[PDB]
Design an enzyme around this catalytic site. Structure first.
Site, PDB file in Angstrom:
ATOM      1  CB  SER A   1      -0.987  -0.018   1.197  1.00  0.00           C
ATOM      2  OG  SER A   1      -1.903   1.076   1.166  1.00  0.00           O
TER       3      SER A   1
ATOM      4  CG  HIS B   1      -5.572  -2.527  -0.154  1.00  0.00           C
ATOM      5  ND1 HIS B   1      -4.692  -2.502  -1.214  1.00  0.00           N
ATOM      6  CD2 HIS B   1      -5.257  -1.472   0.634  1.00  0.00           C
ATOM      7  CE1 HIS B   1      -3.869  -1.477  -1.068  1.00  0.00           C
ATOM      8  NE2 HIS B   1      -4.180  -0.843   0.053  1.00  0.00           N
TER       9      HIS B   1
ATOM     10  CD  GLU C   1      -4.707  -4.423  -4.385  1.00  0.00           C
ATOM     11  OE1 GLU C   1      -5.112  -4.286  -3.211  1.00  0.00           O
ATOM     12  OE2 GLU C   1      -3.512  -4.722  -4.652  1.00  0.00           O
TER      13      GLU C   1
HETATM   14  O1  LIG Z   1     -13.413   4.749  11.915  1.00  0.00           O
HETATM   15  C1  LIG Z   1     -13.905   4.952  10.786  1.00  0.00           C
HETATM   16  N1  LIG Z   1     -13.164   4.763   9.644  1.00  0.00           N
HETATM   17  C2  LIG Z   1     -11.797   4.220   9.721  1.00  0.00           C
HETATM   18  C3  LIG Z   1     -11.066   4.253   8.396  1.00  0.00           C
HETATM   19  C4  LIG Z   1      -9.691   3.595   8.637  1.00  0.00           C
HETATM   20  C5  LIG Z   1      -9.512   2.322   7.781  1.00  0.00           C
HETATM   21  C6  LIG Z   1      -8.227   1.553   8.215  1.00  0.00           C
HETATM   22  C7  LIG Z   1      -7.791   0.603   7.085  1.00  0.00           C
HETATM   23  N2  LIG Z   1      -7.221  -0.684   7.471  1.00  0.00           N
HETATM   24  C8  LIG Z   1      -7.013  -1.569   6.506  1.00  0.00           C
HETATM   25  C9  LIG Z   1      -5.789  -1.587   5.873  1.00  0.00           C
HETATM   26  C10 LIG Z   1      -5.598  -2.523   4.833  1.00  0.00           C
HETATM   27  N3  LIG Z   1      -6.580  -3.338   4.463  1.00  0.00           N
HETATM   28  C11 LIG Z   1      -7.770  -3.311   5.071  1.00  0.00           C
HETATM   29  C12 LIG Z   1      -8.760  -4.208   4.672  1.00  0.00           C
HETATM   30  C13 LIG Z   1     -10.006  -4.192   5.287  1.00  0.00           C
HETATM   31  C14 LIG Z   1     -10.256  -3.286   6.315  1.00  0.00           C
HETATM   32  C15 LIG Z   1      -9.278  -2.403   6.726  1.00  0.00           C
HETATM   33  C16 LIG Z   1      -8.031  -2.423   6.114  1.00  0.00           C
HETATM   34  C17 LIG Z   1      -4.364  -2.673   4.149  1.00  0.00           C
HETATM   35  C18 LIG Z   1      -3.491  -1.455   4.326  1.00  0.00           C
HETATM   36  C19 LIG Z   1      -3.398  -1.096   5.838  1.00  0.00           C
HETATM   37  C20 LIG Z   1      -4.769  -0.693   6.326  1.00  0.00           C
HETATM   38  C21 LIG Z   1     -15.272   5.402  10.625  1.00  0.00           C
HETATM   39  C22 LIG Z   1     -15.610   6.634  10.006  1.00  0.00           C
HETATM   40  C23 LIG Z   1     -16.919   7.073   9.856  1.00  0.00           C
HETATM   41  C24 LIG Z   1     -17.933   6.261  10.356  1.00  0.00           C
HETATM   42  N4  LIG Z   1     -17.642   5.000  10.953  1.00  0.00           N
HETATM   43  C25 LIG Z   1     -16.319   4.590  11.089  1.00  0.00           C
END
Ligand SMILES: O=C(NCCCCCCNc1c2c(nc3ccccc13)CCCC2)c1cccnc1
Ligand SMILES: O=C(NCCCCCCNc1c2c(nc3ccccc13)CCCC2)c1cccnc1
Ligand SMILES: *[C@@H]1O[C@H](CO)[C@@H](O[C@@H]2O[C@H](CO)[C@@H](O)[C@H](O)[C@H]2NC(C)=O)[C@H](O)[C@H]1NC(C)=O
Ligand SMILES: *[C@@H]1O[C@H](CO)[C@@H](O[C@@H]2O[C@H](CO)[C@@H](O)[C@H](O)[C@H]2NC(C)=O)[C@H](O)[C@H]1NC(C)=O
Ligand SMILES: *[C@@H]1O[C@H](CO)[C@@H](O)[C@H](O)[C@H]1NC(C)=O
Ligand SMILES: *[C@@H]1O[C@H](CO)[C@@H](O)[C@H](O)[C@H]1NC(C)=O
Lengths: 534, 534
Positions: free
Chosen positions: B199, B439, B326
């Site tokens: 990534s 991803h 992805e």
């Molecule tokens: O907390 C909230 N959003 C968080 C956004 C952060 C996402 C972190 C990403 N982490 C992941 C990452 C990766 N793959 C994923 C696959 C599935 C799920 C998450 C992954 C790979 C790269 C490293 C981060 C939110 C916002 C608004 C309403 N509800 C929740």
């Protein structure tokens, strides 16, 4: 009255000739005049109606074909040669031909054929346009009209009344008038006249459906491989002006007035006009013709797309379709890398070239989109793919997608649509394999030539011809190609919602939906939008 | 010297801890500092090198993770929760971790991991980034660095020296410096260091390959699901300025000078910066992040595309690839119609919506082209197709096509390219079927978690993990993932001419060519050209 072959019309008496057909016979009346010769000063003018005659007009032989450019790419080769005039050309060419059952019917269905040829060529008298098989086999009265092609039919100096534009269309209108008026005497029912045609004739048919002055004079319509919105079928009045002027300029005419120019063009012998006909084109191109209908404000009150949108057109039934490989003939004659005697596999650089000529009005981003839509990037030096991809570009752009937009707009307001995709390649076809199912090669099936054993079709090809002829004639007679309550397979109606259509070939009928939608969404929605913004 | 777990470096002595692995043991040194804490006034500044220490630094426990936004969409759900910090966050987070074989090697191959997370998040200390399996199984020394994410790592006021931009990249550079300098004492060979990452870490890796100041400090490189030219990976200096200003504006800062603004942003507690991080984005979008690398003229001398073109980059071997699906994770979190607990079939109107957010920088003609390229018009209310089509739009646009352009430009000038397409969906995957191969879900296979029986993979999944680990490590050690003269199937080199690549999954290796060329020609050639003209 006196006999089967003598018919008296509002224009005078007319003597036909008895003609043999499949071990039987029928009457035929050939070269009946429906207009004053458009000669001398009348060149480029409206057609006037034929002054009635005394005595007995001898209708036993085909008339002269209109003056037109003549194919000489494959001299003596029947493939190209069957489209040429098989009669002496003359500006005195406004005649029609009638095939009639024996015995004379009282009030049978009438079918009126309108030949193609890019509005630059065509003849009512060709072998493939012979109506005796259709007339005999299906019990219809078959009419073939003619009309002026070339500058003679389509030179446009809008504003002038000596050369208004569109007169070749008015020619056809008038022969339709003449049928409305006289066809009863031949046993035709004038309330039940289908016009039908191919290519420029298919677009003509649709042009009469669109044009007010023409709509009352026919009942129904069939459009084969053409539609009035094809990009080659019509031009603005400005464009037609430019081109008539450019024509004058190739013949050293005075150009300072419509009057001087027309006077000049009328001084000329016909072949002089034909000799420089092709030099007026604005672009290096294929599937484009010099003198075509203009959007004038009279014959067409407004632009075509606005007429289709607003429902401003005759509402009746239509039956139309296309052929699998519409583009092949254009690339053969006009595109680098294509030869009659070769498999014509195409370099990628000849591809580029082809696209340029096929979509002449495109900026570079246009050509990039067209190229992208049509290139398998996994295998891009495949010369069969490059060949066949460009074949499709030409047919999609010029024939299929315009017809498909026509259909979709028409079916909103209309009273019945029956769509076909004709994809049989004939066993006796003289052209090479690569050209596939060619522009104009459904005609022979429509006109019944497979029943004539000596032309060497298969029996299943005979059977397809009889099937098609009976679809065409049943439709002309009823508004539906299907016969009521019959064990046969049903050609479904084409509707806005489900968009059904049938293949036409020797295999058992198959119904499909959404004829070349993916490509035609590219041609009818996206490409135009892309060229408008850029 | 005294024992296996006490290593003396140029920065001081360091005591590891013995750690169990698959019924054996190895040494591990966790949370070794390579930079002064970037705290107080040093926030937004370059990293300074860590002042050497007296005594024995206790490297037995993981360090603090850097300050970052925290996922709370599925609280307690392991799928999302495994990416979050599993340690207390602190601005004092510039540490690295070393796993080392037992007994201590003398000069073994080194692998340095660079975590992803959009440059807004990530941790060196997660379970999936645990190096003990790789280190043990393949006999490599495994390093995991950290770097500042968010504004803390990437706030850019170009021209200023208090907040220049890019400092999170310099963070990584410095940990690479520290490895070049000290890794021998842990038995690593500093001439044989592969950097690798996923990534934002994959794009980082490529960023060090591009950047002069970074190229001397590693030997080779692996890029997983990221490349330095991804449209989310970098911004102009103007854009970064706008965004830092907008950040200040969300915190009621004085904006009339770089000095006042920075002073203000440095007064703030970390969570205040995170609370408004997302509000600076110029567009409503997915797969876009607020603070990312800038194209500054220093770290990157010129624009990326010109560097790739002109060959201005380190020439060594690279091994890279992508995952089948992805985009799915981005649409789940950010796109209407997608839910974790549903099949997420998508209305056509949610489709339209999705495209808008996926290609934020597109005018209407853009959205029309993207929509056209990705819609089966034969069957356009298929909600599985609409779902899966948009999945692909996101991954193509954001990950696959940028990587594919990177690859093609790199292989002209480079010394070896090995491309993979990872498409195994894990038997124990907690996420729903529809997100496919997600991803970040090749990582667990790279880090050997399938060997840990209690994580419940299949045996063939174990076998794929061991295969991949040995490809990755053999490549780091030699420039080639294949072992010389061995009966195994051969991962062919990727060349400009033939473009080969392999699937990575449980079925016998299959070689392919031209990874998503058709789509990537749309994304890398045509779309950009279309938006430039319009
Ligand atoms: O907390 C909230 N959003 C968080 C956004 C952060 C996402 C972190 C990403 N982490 C992941 C990452 C990766 N793959 C994923 C696959 C599935 C799920 C998450 C992954 C790979 C790269 C490293 C981060 C939110 C916002 C608004 C309403 N509800 C929740
Ligand atoms: O004479 C030359 N070109 C003639 C162009 C006229 C083409 C007439 C078209 N006739 C056809 C027509 C149709 N289909 C055809 C299929 C294959 C071949 C011809 C067809 C269907 C519509 C009616 C005309 C020429 C020009 C330059 C060099 N060599 C020859
Ligand atoms: C074509 O038009 C005719 C009449 O203009 C339609 O026939 C009518 O259909 C309506 C609506 O179903 C019926 O209520 C009437 O009883 C019908 N009238 C007659 C005289 O039959 C016909 O539906 C149209 N056909 C198509 C294919 O659109
Ligand atoms: C990578 O570079 C090395 C050297 O920089 C290349 O090895 C040379 O290949 C040339 C051309 O075939 C030979 O004539 C030399 O003898 C080789 N040198 C050595 C030391 O072996 C190698 O071909 C390159 N590899 C790739 C995959 O591009
Ligand atoms: C009709 O004209 C043709 C052709 O020139 C001729 O062969 C035929 O005998 C003519 N018959 C009559 C009655 O004029
Ligand atoms: C190292 O620190 C940890 C964590 O706080 C502790 O459990 C351990 O006993 C310490 N050992 C030494 C030698 O400091």
């Amino acid at each position: 009255d006196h006999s089967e072959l003598l018919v008296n019309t509002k224009s005078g008496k007319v003597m036909g000739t008895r003609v043999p057909v499949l071990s039987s016979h029928i009457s035929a009346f050939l070269g009946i005049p429906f207009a004053e010769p458009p000669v001398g000063n009348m060149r480029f003018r409206r057609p006037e109606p034929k002054k009635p005659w005394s005595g007995v007009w001898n209708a036993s032989t085909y008339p002269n074909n209109c003056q037109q450019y003549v194919d000489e790419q494959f001299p003596g080769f029947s493939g190209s040669e069957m489209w040429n005039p098989n009669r002496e050309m003359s500006e005195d060419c406004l005649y029609l031909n009638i095939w009639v059952p024996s015995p004379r019917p009282k009030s049978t269905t009438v079918m009126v054929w309108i030949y193609g040829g890019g509005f630059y060529s065509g003849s009512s008298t060709l072998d493939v346009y012979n109506g005796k098989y259709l007339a005999y086999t299906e019990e219809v009265v078959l009419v073939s009209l003619s009309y002026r092609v070339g500058a003679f039919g389509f030179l446009a100096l809008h504003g002038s009344q000596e050369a208004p534009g569109n007169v070749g269309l008015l020619d056809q209108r008038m022969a339709l008038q003449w049928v409305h008026d006289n066809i009863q005497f031949f046993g035709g029912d004038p309330k039940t006249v289908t016009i039908f045609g191919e290519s420029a004739g298919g677009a003509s048919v649709g042009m009469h459906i669109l044009s007010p002055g023409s709509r009352d004079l026919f009942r129904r319509a069939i459009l084969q491989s053409g539609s009035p919105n094809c990009p080659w079928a019509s031009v603005s009045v400005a464009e037609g002006r430019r081109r008539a002027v450019e024509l004058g300029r190739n013949l050293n005419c005075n150009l300072n007035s419509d009057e001087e120019l027309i006077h000049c063009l009328r001084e000329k012998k016909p072949q002089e006009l034909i000799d420089v006909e092709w030099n007026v084109l604005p672009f290096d191109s294929i599937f484009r013709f010099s003198f075509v209908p203009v959007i004038d404000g009279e014959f067409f009150p407004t632009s075509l797309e606005s007429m289709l949108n607003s429902g401003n057109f005759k509402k009746t039934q239509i039956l139309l379709g296309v052929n699998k490989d519409e583009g092949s003939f254009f690339l053969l004659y006009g595109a680098p890398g294509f030869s009659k005697d070769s498999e014509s596999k195409i370099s990628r650089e000849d591809f580029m070239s082809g696209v340029k000529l096929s979509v002449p009005h495109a900026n570079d981003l246009g050509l990039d989109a067209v190229t992208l839509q049509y290139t398998d990037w996994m295998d891009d030096n495949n010369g069969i793919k490059n060949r066949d991809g460009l074949d499709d570009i030409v047919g999609d752009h010029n024939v299929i997608c315009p017809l498909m937009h026509f259909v979709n707009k028409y079916t909103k307001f209309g009273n019945g649509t029956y769509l076909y995709f004709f994809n049989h390649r004939a066993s006796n076809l003289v052209w090479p394999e690569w050209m596939g199912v060619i522009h104009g090669y459904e005609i022979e099936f429509v006109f019944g030539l497979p029943l004539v054993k000596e032309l060497n079709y298969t029996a299943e090809e005979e059977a397809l011809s009889r099937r098609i002829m009976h679809y065409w004639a049943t439709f002309a007679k009823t508004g539906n190609p299907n016969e009521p309550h019959s064990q046969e397979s049903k050609w479904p109606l084409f509707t806005t919602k489900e968009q059904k259509f049938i293949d036409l070939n020797t295999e058992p009928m198959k119904v499909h939906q959404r004829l070349r939608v993916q490509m035609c969404v590219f041609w009818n929605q996206f490409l135009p939008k892309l060229l408008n913004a850029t």
